[PDB]
Design a protein around this ligand. Sequence first.
Ligand SMILES: [Fe+3]
Ligand SMILES: [Fe+3]
Lengths: 258, 258
Amino acid sequence: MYPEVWNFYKKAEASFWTAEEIDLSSDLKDFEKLNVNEKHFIKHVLAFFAASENLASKFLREVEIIEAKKFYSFQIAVENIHSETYSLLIDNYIKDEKERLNLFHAIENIPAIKNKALWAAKWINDTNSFAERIVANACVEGILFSGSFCAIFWFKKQNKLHGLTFSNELISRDEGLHTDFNCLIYSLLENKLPENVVQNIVKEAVEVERSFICESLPCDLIGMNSRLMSQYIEFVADRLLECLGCSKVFHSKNPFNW
Amino acid sequence: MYPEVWNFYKKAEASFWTAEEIDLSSDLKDFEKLNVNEKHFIKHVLAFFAASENLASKFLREVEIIEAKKFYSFQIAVENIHSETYSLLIDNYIKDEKERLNLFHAIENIPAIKNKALWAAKWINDTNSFAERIVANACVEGILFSGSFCAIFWFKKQNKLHGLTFSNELISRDEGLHTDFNCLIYSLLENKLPENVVQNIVKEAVEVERSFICESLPCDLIGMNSRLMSQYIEFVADRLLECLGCSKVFHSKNPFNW
Ligand SMILES: [Fe+3]
Ligand SMILES: [Fe+3]
């Protein structure tokens, strides 16, 4: 078998959770005590998470190793559970349906999606190299939403938002596992990529990610600094290059120790 | 939204379980207390379960309702857990690699496979009607293996095999849920089939199923009766037709109340 891969499965499995353990009960009081620029940051972020797609199922049919198909088929279930958690959150902070939608079109045309899709067109759901796909994959599950995830933790450091932050917790922890996973498949990889290509994929993922949190929907107005955040991406990116067995490209220290 | 389909998801989810909860520790003593005809019945049925494919994934792409892809994407993870449990059981009852292999090489040419495969070619994995697919699916997950599942209850009535019968129980219960499901989608169906054709599919499922437990690997000597089994299928298949909103075809009462 492939014993290190099986450890990721048993860890995802034994780490399984559902939307029932969340109980948004206790803080829309927090959200109405929040202020006016912070309110639509959240309303936009949650609506951004609910937009992105087929991915694991495309590697489910490619990766011909039972241990790994098992991890990916388990990925889609857990990822569906992240999806419901958001629909449930979008259900509570954005309670009445007028505004739900007034605000789903509102994203569609949000250059962060211009960037996110165009990138997905160039590297993912593509037709040249499998190697390229997992690298671009490990960015999707590593670099993308990295910014958004950190910005909900800025509410967790204020002891506000009730499982906006606790769900956020489980979801990023989860998405962390997926990331190390695509590293290991890279690590098992027949003919690895030249570091020159991997860094392009990565840089572009970074530039794509930043057009969310620093530009489209600026963290610089939940209390954060867009430039410090821009540095968090860099550091996330570098971490990821090391997990991919590559040398860094932005050498940048942890802007937040939290 | 489709609230009845949501209920089957939340009942799958809330009914989730893993291979860790079985721990086969306590009865290969039973296995070796058993006799020759039962030994290889079991070694063959376990090997039969580990041979059949992609199914729900094919419906995951077709059925364009969130609540339902949710149920299907979770089906494939729980069906992976069924698989693993079987692999683990083949690992204990058939401990030495010698035979793991001379056994999937008996099986992989058994007349029940020629049956199983051919009927999968005529109805499933097909290019004519989606209605047919669900009916044929409801059979895959309703009539097929019903014989084999009942044969393992035979061993549960004798207070033997530790979770051969206990997993057997969680897997049947689970397959039970997936059958009920396919009923509901046919029940929400745009244009339902004429019962003339539904009965053909089921007949042929029935015949295919019987070629396993009453012919290829006869329950008739783990202690059971082949004919009585053959009527359990009919009864099972009758129940299915009611579940599918059709009249019966072999009106036959419960041969076993257990
Ligand atoms: Fe993920
Ligand atoms: Fe099933």
